[PDB]
């Protein structure tokens, strides 16, 4: 609690002052975005002092060949009027705030943001090597400029624009375990193709394996040729319209095989990393202050209810188990035989005791 | 949980070794790896870091192009080869875990392994 | 360009009980990413001390760090025998991390 961040204008007129960069998504209280901004008289010239909080989506635009640029279409706004102060408003400080301007003077305004639940968290978009702008995905941004009223256009030089995050972190009480289970029935038979699979436990960390027990009892003419695990990222998009894509994070292809009227049981382990998953441009990734790298995007948590449609990117992991079934049959290769089921969990950092850093050890 | 290494003797000027660190008992996905060294009364020399995670590595100036640092995941081994050695390398190699989310210190260091280098 | 880390005293003797403070100055600012170790010879590294100030999960609570711009200190409040042994801070904001040169604490007798 003895260090705060803090970001200039470029003419030095502005100074905003905060506490911290991420702010937490307890799904019911997200905390609330509190800091001081320090108007500089002997530069300010310009009757009105502004901070607005901003919930923005981030593309590039496919069909242009512009390298570096970017477009970032809203997606909340706050705005607050900090210089002057604007009677008909006691609001108290934080003690955040209240520290703030002790040591910095009267010449520093509090302003305070409350981010509404069921807004996007900062998730930013695998780049590829044809993308060298700021980074696409969801991100919040705090600002603070000088004008005269809101309608005005504002000066580059007098504004200071500062990145922020708002992260989720993994619940204490783990889920139920991850079982699933199917049966499928073919044509002349009535004796199935059962495959059941689980996982160890609903909840992982980033870097962690995963262990899934699969079983299969074919009581059928067919055999499986091939086995595959997969462990597959979700993302559910939305901002005109709904965007979906699933794609496989780390994947096994086993070459085990089950005979007719046989039984199978094998544990695999797969461990979701980044390494192996540069090429995949657009994959989800935890927000990005500036350029550093960050994990695989951690699971949105969401307040049970009815389907919203959340704007933003909301990120789901599942395994996904399926069997490559021979397709001998009446059917010739017609048609598909295989058998497949999938297992959502949970993928996210624990609670830390300390905040996360913008980067880890520069070099 | 265990980092134990392998791997440390008497090698020739010039000649080359390879240092072996086991690790035991976490995550290598989520922790990311280190060689620190020790020169007999003389305090810690940062050597070289690799993550596994993210698949970069990191080189301590002094050692650039005769040192690689290298991770066999599924083993869950690290390790070190150490190319052109002089005798100044001689020291006691510490094998040094530290936490992927995120680096808070090396938070478990090996026994270590001693490397001489002398005609 | 390597980030020094200046410990200081080199070396301080005194005895059981005691409050003591080791400190180490950074070349330049570090932010709070500085760890601190305790060696006792023959044997390898533990850690007291990351982000500067935050004690490490087992350490005994009579370990503190605290920061001054690029002024870092550990100290001891109530010494006791299990502590006797060196000390070393580490800057781990820029590559390379660098460690300080140990601070020896003995017995007074």
């Known amino acids: 609690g003895t260090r705060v961040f803090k970001k200039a204008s470029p003419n030095g007129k502005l100074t905003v002052y905060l506490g911290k960069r991420d702010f937490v998504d307890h799904i019911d209280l997200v905390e609330p975005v509190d800091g001081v901004v320090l108007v500089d008289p002997e530069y300010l010239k310009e009757r009105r002092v502004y901070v607005t909080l901003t919930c923005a989506f981030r593309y590039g635009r496919e069909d242009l060949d512009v390298l570096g640029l970017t477009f970032r279409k809203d997606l909340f706004v706050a705005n607050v009027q900090s210089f002057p102060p604007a009677p008909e408003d006691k609001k108290p400080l934080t003690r955040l705030q209240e520290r703030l301007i002790k040591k910095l003077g009267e010449h520093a305004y509090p302003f305070t943001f409350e981010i509404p639940p069921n807004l996007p968290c900062s998730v930013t978009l695998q780049p590829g090597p044809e993308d060298t702008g700021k980074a696409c995905g969801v991100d919040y941004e705090v600002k603070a400029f000088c004008a005269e009223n809101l309608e005005e256009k504002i000066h580059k030089r007098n504004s200071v624009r500062l990145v922020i995050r708002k992260v989720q972190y993994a619940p204490e009480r783990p889920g139920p375990q991850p079982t699933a289970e199917t049966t499928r029935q073919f044509l002349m038979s009535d004796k199935p193709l059962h495959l059941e699979a689980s996982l160890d436990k609903e909840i992982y960390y980033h870097g962690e394996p995963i262990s899934v027990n699969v079983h299969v009892t074919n009581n059928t003419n067919k055999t499986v040729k091939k086995i595959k695990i997969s462990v597959r990222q979700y993302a559910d998009i939305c901002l005109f319209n709904t965007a979906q894509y699933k794609c496989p994070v780390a994947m096994e292809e086993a070459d085990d095989t089950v005979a007719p009227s046989s039984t199978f049981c094998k544990v695999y382990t797969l461990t979701p990393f980044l390494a192996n998953n540069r090429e995949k441009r657009g994959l989800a990734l935890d927000g990005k202050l500036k350029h550093e790298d960050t994990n695989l995007a951690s699971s949105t948590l969401l307040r049970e209810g009815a389907n919203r449609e959340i704007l933003g990117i909301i990120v789901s992991y599942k395994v996904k188990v399926k069997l490559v079934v021979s397709r001998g049959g009446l059917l010739g290769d017609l048609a598909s035989s295989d058998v497949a089921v999938e297992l959502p969990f949970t993928l996210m950092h624990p609670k830390p005791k300390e905040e996360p850093p913008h980067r880890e050890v520069p070099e | 949980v265990q980092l134990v290494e392998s791997g440390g003797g008497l090698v020739q000027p010039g000649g080359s070794l390879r240092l072996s660190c086991a690790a035991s008992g976490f995550n290598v996905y989520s922790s990311s790896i280190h060689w620190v060294r020790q020169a007999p009364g003389k305090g810690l020399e940062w050597v070289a870091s690799?993550?596994?995670?993210?698949?970069?590595?990191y080189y301590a100036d002094s050692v650039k192009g005769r040192f690689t640092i290298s991770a066999d995941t599924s083993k869950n081994t690290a390790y070190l080869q150490m190319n052109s050695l002089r005798a100044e390398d001689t020291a006691v190699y510490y094998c040094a875990r530290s936490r992927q989310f995120w680096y808070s210190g090396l938070d478990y260091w090996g026994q270590g392994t001693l490397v001489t280098v002398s005609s | 360009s390597d980030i020094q880390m200046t410990q200081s005293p080199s070396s301080l003797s005194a005895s059981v009980g005691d409050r003591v403070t080791i400190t180490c100055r950074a070349s330049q600012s570090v932010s709070s990413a500085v760890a601190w170790y305790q060696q006792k010879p023959g044997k390898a590294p533990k850690l007291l001390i990351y982000?500067?100030?935050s004690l490490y999960s087992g350490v005994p609570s009579r370990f503190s760090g605290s920061r001054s711009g690029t002024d870092f200190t550990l100290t001891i409040s109530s010494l006791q025998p299990e502590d006797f042994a060196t000390y070393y801070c580490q800057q781990y904001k820029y590559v390379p991390v660098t460690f300080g040169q140990g601070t020896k604490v003995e017995i007074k007798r």
């Open positions: 982000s500067a100030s």
């Open positions: 690799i993550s596994s995670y993210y698949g970069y590595t």
